[PDB]
Write a protein that binds this ligand. Structure first.
Ligand SMILES: [Zn+2]
Ligand SMILES: [Zn+2]
Ligand SMILES: [Zn+2]
Ligand SMILES: [Zn+2]
Ligand SMILES: [Zn+2]
Lengths: 76, 216
């Protein structure tokens, strides 16, 4: 199932997922495709922050939904 | 020449496991399930999809999920390219492609994009033109279907997308296929680094081994 991930701004990339994919799984797919470490990824859907252990279906994320990717910055 | 017509006509798809032949119905995702043997495979590259925790490769970081191992020339990756960049890969290799619809085309009712999809509608499926916006220079197709068309030509001619990769893309592909995070050697300048990565990727990671190719 196709979903879109867009940054700000920001190329849109596509992922193939299933609704039962965890947010952790999604971050790993973004790493595979784009090289961004999961620990630097913040994903948002309809203004809601997506938490690692939950699944896409938990957030009612369906075909061709768009997630927003914001990079995380931690101090040293 | 007839590349566009070949993309637009009804295509076949064969189960890579049991060899059963189907007619492709567009409109679904990249996860295909053979109805005869239940084999799950990618429509872009024919590699297998493994469900969570049943993939064979250590260490596939995407192991805890439904996934396949796609080659760098699978639509799975190439659908993210701009049309302009897909066009450049073709142009760099002297492959012709359409930007305008056939001279003797036919008006699409409602649409929009002319690609026929089996769409979900209330209580079932219905064959219907895609109907999405058709940008100038996209041969009467929408953005996504135009890219699929260009990818069909790229794959037919065994063109290697890595030839256009930036260094970051070479590094990402290297980590993915060779399971190592590359870095410049001491004394190695940025252009020499990029050349080495491209060289290593090309000679070590083949393009899709199950993607059908022009045989002539
Ligand atoms: Zn799917
Ligand atoms: Zn089969
Ligand atoms: Zn694939
Ligand atoms: Zn795997
Ligand atoms: Zn279309």
């Amino acid at each position: 199932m196709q979903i879109f991930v867009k940054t700000l701004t920001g190329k849109t990339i596509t992922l193939e997922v299933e609704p039962s994919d965890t947010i952790e799984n999604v971050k790993a797919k973004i790493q595979d495709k784009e090289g961004i470490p999961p620990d630097q990824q913040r994903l948002i859907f309809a203004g809601k922050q997506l938490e690692d252990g939950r699944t896409l279906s938990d957030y009612n994320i369906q075909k061709e939904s768009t997630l927003h990717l914001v990079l995380r910055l931690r101090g040293g | 020449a007839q590349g566009l017509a070949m993309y637009l006509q009804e295509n076949g798809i064969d189960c890579p496991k049991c060899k059963f032949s189907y007619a492709l119905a567009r409109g679904g995702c990249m996860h295909f399930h053979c109805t005869q043997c239940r084999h799950q495979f990618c429509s872009g590259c024919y590699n297998a999809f493994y469900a969570k925790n049943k993939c064979p490769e250590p260490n596939c970081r995407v192991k805890k999920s439904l996934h396949g191992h796609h080659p760098r020339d699978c639509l799975f990756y190439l659908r993210d390219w701009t049309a302009l960049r897909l066009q450049k890969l073709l142009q760099d290799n002297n492959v012709m492609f359409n930007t305008e619809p056939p001279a003797g085309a036919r008006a699409v009712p409602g649409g929009g994009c002319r690609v026929i999809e089996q769409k979900e509608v209330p209580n079932g499926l219905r064959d219907e033109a895609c109907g999405k916006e058709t940008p100038a220079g996209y041969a009467g197709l929408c953005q996504a279907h135009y890219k699929e068309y260009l990818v069909s030509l790229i794959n037919a001619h065994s063109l290697d997308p890595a030839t256009l990769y930036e260094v970051e893309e070479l590094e990402t592909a290297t980590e993915r296929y060779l399971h190592v995070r590359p870095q410049p050697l001491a004394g190695e300048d940025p252009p020499a680094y990029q050349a080495r990565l491209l060289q290593k990727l090309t000679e070590e990671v083949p393009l899709g081994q199950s993607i059908p190719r022009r045989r002539k």
